[PDB]
Motif scaffolding. Structure first.
Motif, PDB file in Angstrom:
ATOM      1  N   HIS C 619       0.829  -1.192   0.000  1.00  0.00           N
ATOM      2  CA  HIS C 619       0.000   0.000   0.000  1.00  0.00           C
ATOM      3  C   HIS C 619       0.870   1.252   0.000  1.00  0.00           C
ATOM      4  CE1 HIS C 619      -3.563  -2.412   0.937  1.00  0.00           C
ATOM      5  NE2 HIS C 619      -2.791  -3.064   1.786  1.00  0.00           N
ATOM      6  N   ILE C 620       0.377   2.299  -0.654  1.00  0.00           N
ATOM      7  CA  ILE C 620       0.977   3.623  -0.532  1.00  0.00           C
ATOM      8  C   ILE C 620      -0.149   4.600  -0.238  1.00  0.00           C
ATOM      9  CG2 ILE C 620       2.335   5.422  -1.619  1.00  0.00           C
ATOM     10  CD1 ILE C 620       3.618   3.346  -3.374  1.00  0.00           C
ATOM     11  N   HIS C 621      -0.323   4.949   1.030  1.00  0.00           N
ATOM     12  CA  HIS C 621      -1.479   5.739   1.418  1.00  0.00           C
ATOM     13  C   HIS C 621      -1.231   7.212   1.135  1.00  0.00           C
ATOM     14  CE1 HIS C 621      -2.961   2.526   4.544  1.00  0.00           C
ATOM     15  NE2 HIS C 621      -2.728   2.020   3.348  1.00  0.00           N
ATOM     16  N   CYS C 669      -9.532   1.208   1.405  1.00  0.00           N
ATOM     17  CA  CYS C 669      -9.093  -0.186   1.323  1.00  0.00           C
ATOM     18  C   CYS C 669      -9.720  -1.041   2.416  1.00  0.00           C
ATOM     19  CB  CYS C 669      -7.568  -0.288   1.407  1.00  0.00           C
ATOM     20  SG  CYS C 669      -6.862   0.256   2.986  1.00  0.00           S
ATOM     21  N   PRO C 684      -5.988   5.184   0.217  1.00  0.00           N
ATOM     22  CA  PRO C 684      -4.880   4.231   0.342  1.00  0.00           C
ATOM     23  C   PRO C 684      -4.483   3.614  -0.997  1.00  0.00           C
ATOM     24  CG  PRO C 684      -6.856   3.165   0.890  1.00  0.00           C
ATOM     25  CD  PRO C 684      -7.265   4.511   0.489  1.00  0.00           C
ATOM     26  N   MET C 687      -2.306  -0.104  -4.707  1.00  0.00           N
ATOM     27  CA  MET C 687      -2.088  -1.282  -3.871  1.00  0.00           C
ATOM     28  C   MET C 687      -1.455  -2.396  -4.708  1.00  0.00           C
ATOM     29  SD  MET C 687      -5.541  -1.190  -1.579  1.00  0.00           S
ATOM     30  CE  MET C 687      -6.636  -1.425  -2.964  1.00  0.00           C
TER      31      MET C 687
HETATM   32 ZN   LIG Z   1      -3.308   0.900   1.063  1.00  0.00          ZN
END
Ligand SMILES: [Zn+2]
Ligand SMILES: [Mg+2]
Lengths: 59, 79, 860, 59, 335, 208
Positions: C619-621, C669, C684, C687
């Motif tokens: 994940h890269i929120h 997410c 988020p 993914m």
């Molecule tokens: Zn995420």
């Protein structure tokens, strides 16, 4: 840790990664110790007799 | 012709030098005076009333030159 | 030529301008040779029978003095005579070259005791000296040719107009102008003072203006007193002065322009009767003034420096009304320092308005000048802004802990005011904190005006290596002497008609331009004032250009004008100002992130791939408010990430990310964040997965390969051009106070786009503007070409041609050199610019730019 | 930049010459605030008087 | 000191205090050094500071209490130049006294541990020997001229190695000192004395970095005089103050003028000399109202000025003149 | 002001380039009509493809000075240029009675195939970049109306002040006005300035 006398004394350096290809995480190397001889930090922990980890994290 | 009928400051600064040098080197006076004994003061007057026998040779940058008598040029000073 | 002198100079007002006083300590040790002639011997035998002569060396070379009682020995006309220094000789005065300001003057010698040099106070300007201990050298023309050319070229009346400005080199100084002011405010004189002043100049005296009244006798005006310094039968027309037949008919009121109306009359006298009447005007006027000041006196008081208390309460009610609420905005706003100074000078002007309501302070200071009108508010009003981070020699750490050190009874007692602002003045004293702040400010000015300063020193040699060999030839063609090539066909404009008083053939005008451009450099460096330090590099941008493209940050800026009005849509202008920024302003992915979480779990069942290649899910929120603020969608992020990661593995890079997933940006997410963050899944996005190592054998050595593509996901751009470094909307005030424009007279408020390109500018010059124009294609309709030049003047030469850069170099050197010296002959600017633009393109005046008389002979 | 001569023209020149402290010149690439009064000088060194010229603020 | 601009205080407290002519020593018979200098009548200032009172060294002040009037003179005090009074200069004011020492040396007695340049006369008249004695040195009352022989360091037969005066040194002999070293290296010391009054090229300064050159020495009866008959000792130009930002000099002059004056209405109700401010401590200074009310108590005008009459025409000068004492200084490197 | 902002962006980069090149040949004094250069961009993109247009009859701008001076262009919409492309587009088109051609490079041209571009006998060629042609430098406010002098007035200039050819204030052969009007070494240009300082000043330059 400087000392004017006793010209064998050391520094701890954390912002050097030894490479820069993609990126590495900053790890602590206890750099030059006797005007040569870099060591990582944990060898100099367990050389001085730390029992285990989670006390060195508490140290 | 074509070459600036006035006189430069640099040409006055040489003709008065040579004139007063020759007057200090035993040349005859050519004007009436009033007892002045300074050769620049002497040399000023025949310029002031157009009485000098010199020929000024203005060069040109291409290679030719000019011929002019110092009586011809206007060192006037009128305003 | 006498080779040396060691003496202080002093002043003397009652002795003529081109006269100089020699000490007898050195005058009896300096020799003038002279030739014995048929004419001079009736004078020389008077000089030689008594003393005041020396060795009578002829060709027999007799070094016998006038001491051994040899007597007359009436010499041969033809010999040469060494004598002493009589009166009426000529000398040549200079200092050691601190600068090559034209200190070369010729003066007449008077011999006295009291071992200093006594010059007129009017030679403090041309010789550039004050009277606190200056040392001068003296030189003696020994040959007769030396005396000839020195007296003909270098006298005061020969040099009466400045060859560097075009004005008079002699203007009325300190006490004389005060004497004229107090003579103007006292318009009438009595009989006795009038007849006493009449002794000095000339023209006996006119008849009295008021010839009788009821009470007094006759009364004069002071214009009739001014008539006494005139020459005979003067007739000139002026702005306020009217002179008919050696009389001053009318004279304008204006005391504010008094140093000009006097300066009008002297110029008219120099036009009508020459320079030797202007010097007679000065030599008759100056003691006539200095004797008029003698039975009145002029002094200071303590009540002059004491501003009144209710006015002090007025000015203290403005530090905490419009300056403390403005420094409340200075807490976050940086670059309003010129707004800062605008409000400050708005305070300083009304402060200086009060202390001109006294008789003595109106008459010692020049009211108009900005230089010395704030100095007096620093000692009756308040000082002002002593500290900032933009006084760029002390670092930011000194500013931050000087701000911290305001715990010294300033936080223990107060928080009002601010550090760097002094509410007190020199006259009432400074308590120790603001004394320390004033000390760091004065120290910084000392360090700035002390260090370096060899840049005009090397710039003088770098202007002398190339501008030396340029004269005016006999026909008028300004040519290089060692190449005989026309640099400029004709000098000064409209001087080809036969009216003289102007330049002649022979003048080394390049060496004139070198000194006339080098002097404003030192006047701008040795004064560290902000208007004198802002304009020091505007000469260096033009004169110190380098032809080989160094690709600097001045080589990247482009200003953009946008003028497509519509007339009455009311904020269509500012909507035009910002949408073109929106198409070009760069935003990225690495800025709007918060965190980064790889996790083997939570997608074990989402891993449906038959051989189980899928285990890790990074994940890269994001943060929601910035993604929702600038109207940035989520699916275009998927677009711009997927096509970039495709189009960069199509580039010959590696085969490490060929099987990238880049799934979907979901904005919710799951209830994630095991390690404590405790948010509720707000954007988020991204993914992804990284199944490149199909059937991942080692968990930990595969997690590091999911940390060699997180950077290339961070470094992507979302909305904006990838080539743009920045874009700024600024400067709603196009007046003449700002930088160089192409047009603005019409409006007064137009917005602009300061646009900067990053380092994709290749070694070819002129490509930054090329990229900016190749960027704004979708928005060219509301950007305004025919204007909007690039910034650096080499790039303008690359774009618009050489002859545009010529006018731009002219205007930039003009507007630069105005702001320090306030008047300079434009012909030196044009000559410098044509010497830059002669051999092809613009060659500078430095080490890199360097890498690319004989007119007559006498007969008779 | 150590031991000098002792001035004698005043009896005040000797006092000034006996009470001085000196920062050396290390390298002229960003010496920083090495010639500007720092708020730790309060009461110990002097924040008004200093030489000017080659060593302004170092002595 | 907290009233002046910081550059002026830097000037005064680093260069001008270190150069002023004043006290030298209290045993001048032993200091054999080049260019010892000294005044005749050194003084202390009229005011007081805190540190000068706690230290109690009057050798921290090297100059004299001149009376300064700010006024236009005939054009001689322009461009930071100052004008003195000849009568004040003739009563001893700022008169200095310098002492310079001349030195030479020769080997032990006879050893290597001819080139023997033994101190002697060498009677064969090399230069000028009107004042030298037989030992090689002059006597102790001589009047050594513009260029004489000052030490006779000549050998037995060869030419002179003797030290001689150059063009600009002269003066009365004060003492002759003859010492030596361990290996006999005999040392010789001769000191000359001179008395100088300040000439028309010398430099002076105030306590506030306000320096000048003495440009015009004026006779006494031409100065402006007050109704008590007081004459200034130094006159300076009022164009120096509104630019250079030193109001401390005007405040100092008003303070000292309020100290030195008498105090009327002393009969009854007070001893009338006890509420007198003498403390110009730098960061804790008297207010303007204290100084002006003191000048009102002393009888003078509250604005600091004073009415004068001219020394030439003799009638009333129209502009009131600011006068009062100030501690000035005399600097070395005279010319 | 108002803003629409849809574009097939590549066609805009040829609309502006073509309109600039036709303005350049118009100011070199060739037979070119009003409506072919004063069309809008909408009716440009209708007739000439909205997004795509390559090797189109747009490129067939080819005109006469007065009788027999022939100049045509060849636009290259490519991303790489070799000798085969330029030979294939020139060896067929020189048989259409032309004497001078122009080259509109888009990507770049390298010096590795430069002698085979300047081998062409009696047929001089000029190059560009597409990205330079998006403006009119002549329509800019800070541009100066040059006036080229004839050969006779050139000789009268050289003989007036008795001056050689190589002594004049020079101008490089890569200047944005030299390459624009198609000028040659020797030809003398004359500029009249306007400015607060340099108003009535005139200056002569020949090309070197
Ligand atoms: Zn995420
Ligand atoms: Mg001086």
């Amino acid at each position: 840790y400087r000392s004017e006398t006793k010209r064998n004394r050391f520094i701890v350096r954390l912002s050097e990664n030894q490479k820069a290809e993609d990126f590495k995480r900053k790890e602590k190397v206890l750099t030059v110790y006797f005007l040569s001889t870099e060591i990582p930090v944990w060898v100099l922990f367990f050389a001085l007799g730390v029992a285990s980890d989670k006390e060195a994290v508490d140290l | 012709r074509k070459t600036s009928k006035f006189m430069t400051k640099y040409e006055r600064a040489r003709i008065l030098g040579t004139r007063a040098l020759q007057i200090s080197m035993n040349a005859p006076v050519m004007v009436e005076l009033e007892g002045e004994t300074d050769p620049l003061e002497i040399a000023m007057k025949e310029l002031r009333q157009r009485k000098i026998p010199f020929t000024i040779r203005r060069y040109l940058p291409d290679g030719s030159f000019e011929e002019w008598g110092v009586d011809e040029l206007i060192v006037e000073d009128s305003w | 030529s006498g080779f040396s002198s060691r003496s202080v100079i002093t002043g003397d007002a009652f002795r003529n301008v081109n006269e100089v006083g020699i000490p007898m300590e050195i005058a009896h040790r300096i020799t003038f040779e002279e030739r014995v002639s048929v004419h001079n011997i009736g004078y020389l035998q008077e000089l030689v029978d008594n003393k005041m002569c020396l060795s009578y060396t002829q060709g027999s070379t007799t070094y016998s003095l006038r001491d051994g009682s040899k007597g007359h020995t009436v010499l041969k006309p033809g010999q040469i005579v060494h004598r002493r220094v009589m009166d009426g000789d000529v000398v040549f005065i200079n200092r050691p070259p601190t600068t090559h300001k034209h200190s070369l003057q010729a003066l007449r010698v008077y011999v006295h005791e009291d071992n200093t040099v006594k010059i007129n106070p009017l030679m403090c300007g041309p010789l550039s000296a004050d009277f606190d201990g200056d040392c001068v050298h003296l030189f003696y023309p020994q040959s007769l040719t030396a005396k000839a050319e020195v007296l003909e070229l270098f006298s005061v009346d020969k040099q009466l107009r400045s060859s560097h400005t075009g004005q008079l080199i002699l203007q009325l100084g300190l006490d004389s102008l005060l004497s004229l002011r107090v003579m103007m405010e006292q318009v009438f004189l009595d009989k006795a003072s009038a007849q006493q002043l009449a002794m000095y100049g000339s023209r006996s005296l006119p008849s009295p203006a008021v010839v009788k009244s009821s009470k007094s006798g006759p009364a004069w005006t002071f214009f009739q007193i001014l008539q006494l310094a005139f020459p005979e039968r003067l007739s000139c027309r002026g702005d306020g002065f009217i002179v008919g037949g050696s009389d001053l008919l009318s004279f304008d009121f204006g005391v504010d322009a008094l140093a000009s109306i006097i300066n009008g009359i002297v110029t008219g006298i120099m036009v009508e009767k020459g320079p030797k009447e202007a010097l007679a005007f000065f030599d008759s006027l100056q003691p006539l003034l200095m004797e008029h000041l003698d039975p009145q006196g002029f002094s200071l008081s303590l009540e002059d420096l004491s501003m009144s208390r209710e006015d002090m309460g007025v000015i203290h009610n403005l530090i905490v009304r419009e300056i403390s609420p403005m420094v409340s905005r200075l807490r976050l706003s940086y670059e309003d320092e010129l707004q800062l100074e605008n409000s400050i000078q708005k305070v300083k002007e009304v402060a200086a308005n009060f202390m001109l309501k006294s008789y003595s302070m109106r008459n010692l200071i020049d009211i108009k000048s900005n230089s010395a009108i704030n100095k007096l508010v620093q000692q009756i009003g308040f000082l002002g802004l002593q500290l900032s981070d933009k006084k760029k020699l002390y670092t930011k750490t000194l500013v931050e802990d000087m701000a911290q050190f305001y715990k010294k009874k300033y936080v223990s007692t107060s928080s009002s005011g601010d550090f760097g602002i002094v509410k007190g003045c020199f006259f009432h004293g400074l308590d120790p904190y603001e004394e320390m702040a004033h000390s760091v400010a004065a120290r910084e000015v000392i360090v700035r005006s002390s260090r370096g300063l060899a840049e005009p020193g090397t710039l003088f040699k770098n202007l002398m290596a190339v501008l030396r060999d340029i004269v005016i030839t006999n026909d008028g063609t300004v040519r290089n002497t060692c190449s005989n090539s026309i640099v400029q066909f004709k000098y000064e404009l409209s001087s080809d008609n036969e009216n003289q008083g102007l330049f002649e053939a022979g003048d080394p005008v390049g060496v004139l331009a070198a000194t006339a451009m080098s002097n404003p450099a030192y006047k701008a460096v040795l004064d560290s004032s902000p208007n004198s330090n802002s304009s020091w590099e505007l000469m260096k941008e033009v004169l110190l250009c380098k032809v080989n493209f160094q690709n600097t940050t001045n080589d990247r800026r482009v200003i953009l004008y946008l003028n497509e009005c519509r007339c009455g849509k009311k904020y269509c202008q500012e909507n035009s100002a910002y949408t073109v920024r929106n198409k070009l302003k760069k935003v990225s992915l690495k800025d709007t992130a918060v965190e980064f979480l790889v996790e083997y779990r939570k997608q074990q069942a989402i891993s449906e791939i038959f051989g189980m290649d899928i285990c890790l899910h990074g994940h890269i929120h994001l943060n929601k408010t910035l993604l929702e603020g600038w109207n940035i969608s989520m699916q275009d992020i998927l677009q711009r990430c997927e096509d970039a990661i495709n189009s960069l593995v199509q580039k010959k890079k590696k085969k490490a990310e060929d099987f990238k997933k880049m799934n979907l940006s979901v904005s919710e997410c799951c209830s994630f964040r095991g390690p404590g963050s405790s948010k509720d899944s707000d954007m988020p996005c991204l993914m992804f997965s990284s199944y490149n190592a199909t059937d991942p054998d080692l968990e930990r050595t595969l997690d590091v390969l999911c940390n060699t593509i997180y950077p290339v996901l961070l470094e992507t751009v979302i909305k904006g051009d990838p080539r743009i470094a920045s874009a700024n909307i600024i400067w709603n005030s196009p007046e003449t106070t700002t930088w160089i424009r192409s047009l603005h007279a019409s409006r007064r408020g137009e917005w602009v786009l300061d646009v900067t390109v990053e380092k994709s500018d290749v070694k070819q010059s002129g490509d930054a503007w090329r990229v900016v124009i190749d960027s704004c294609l979708s928005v060219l309709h509301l950007i305004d070409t025919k204007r909007s030049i690039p910034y650096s003047i080499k790039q303008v030469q690359e774009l618009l041609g050489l002859s545009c850069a010529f006018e731009q170099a002219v205007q930039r050197l003009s507007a630069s050199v105005r702001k320090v010296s306030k008047g300079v002959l434009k012909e030196h600017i044009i000559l410098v610019a044509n010497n830059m633009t002669c051999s092809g393109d613009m060659l500078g005046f430095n080490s890199g730019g360097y890498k690319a008389s004989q007119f007559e002979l006498l007969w008779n | 930049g150590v031991v000098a001569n002792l001035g004698r023209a005043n009896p005040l020149q000797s006092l000034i010459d006996l009470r001085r402290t000196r920062q050396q010149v290390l390298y002229t690439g960003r010496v920083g605030d090495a010639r500007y009064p720092h708020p730790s000088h309060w009461g110990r060194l002097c924040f008004l008087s200093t030489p000017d010229g080659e060593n302004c603020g170092l002595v | 000191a907290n009233h002046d601009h910081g550059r002026r205080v830097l000037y005064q407290s680093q260069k001008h205090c270190q150069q002023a002519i004043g006290f030298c020593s209290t045993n001048p018979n032993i200091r054999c050094d080049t260019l010892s200098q000294q005044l005749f009548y050194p003084q202390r200032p009229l005011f007081k500071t805190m540190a000068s009172e706690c230290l109690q060294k009057d050798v921290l002040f090297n100059g004299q209490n001149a009376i300064v009037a700010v006024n236009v003179h005939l054009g001689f005090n322009q461009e930071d130049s100052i004008v003195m009074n000849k009568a004040s200069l003739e009563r001893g004011m700022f008169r200095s006294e310098q002492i310079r020492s001349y030195k030479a040396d020769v080997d032990s007695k006879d050893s290597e541990k001819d080139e023997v340049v033994q101190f002697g006369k060498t009677h064969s008249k090399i230069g000028r020997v009107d004042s030298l004695d037989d030992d090689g040195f002059p006597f102790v009352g001589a009047n050594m001229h513009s260029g004489d022989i000052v030490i006779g360091r000549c050998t037995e037969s060869g030419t002179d190695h003797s030290v001689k005066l150059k063009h600009t040194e002269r003066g009365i002999v004060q003492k002759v000192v003859l010492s030596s070293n361990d290996d006999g290296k005999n040392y010789a010391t001769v000191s000359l004395r001179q008395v100088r009054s300040p000439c028309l090229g010398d430099k002076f300064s105030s306590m506030h970095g306000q320096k000048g050159v003495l440009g015009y020495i004026e006779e006494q009866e031409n100065f402006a005089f007050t109704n008590q008959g007081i004459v200034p000792d130094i006159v300076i130009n009022p164009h120096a103050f509104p630019s250079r930002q030193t109001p401390g000099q005007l405040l100092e002059a008003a303070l000292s003028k309020g100290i030195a004056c008498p105090m009327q209405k002393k009969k009854g109700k007070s001893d009338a000399y006890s509420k007198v401010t003498r403390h110009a401590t730098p960061f804790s200074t008297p207010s303007v109202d204290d100084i002006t009310d003191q000048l009102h108590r002393a009888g003078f005008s509250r604005s600091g000025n004073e009415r004068v009459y001219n020394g030439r025409t003799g009638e009333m000068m129209r502009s009131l003149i600011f006068m009062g004492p100030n501690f000035y200084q005399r600097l070395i490197h005279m010319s | 002001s108002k803003y629409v902002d849809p574009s097939s962006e590549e066609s805009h980069r040829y609309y502006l380039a073509r309109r600039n090149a036709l303005e350049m040949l118009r100011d070199r004094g060739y037979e070119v009509s009003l409506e072919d250069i004063n069309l809008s961009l909408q009716d440009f993109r209708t007739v000439y493809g909205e997004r795509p247009d390559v090797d189109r009859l747009r490129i067939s701008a080819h005109h006469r000075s007065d009788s027999s001076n022939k100049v045509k262009v060849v636009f290259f919409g490519t991303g790489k240029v070799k000798v085969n492309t330029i030979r294939s587009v020139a060896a067929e088109i020189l048989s259409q009675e032309t004497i001078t051609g122009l080259i509109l490079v888009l990507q770049n041209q390298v010096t590795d195939k430069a002698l085979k571009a300047i081998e062409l006998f009696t047929f001089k060629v000029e190059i560009f970049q597409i990205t330079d042609l998006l403006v009119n430098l002549t329509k800019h406010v800070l541009s100066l109306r040059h006036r080229v002098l004839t050969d006779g007035e050139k000789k009268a200039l050289l003989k007036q002040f008795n001056i050689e050819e190589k002594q004049l204030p020079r101008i490089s052969k890569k200047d944005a006005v030299v390459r624009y009007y198609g000028l040659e070494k020797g030809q003398i240009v004359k500029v009249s300035y306007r400015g607060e300082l340099t108003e009535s000043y005139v200056a002569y330059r020949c090309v070197w």
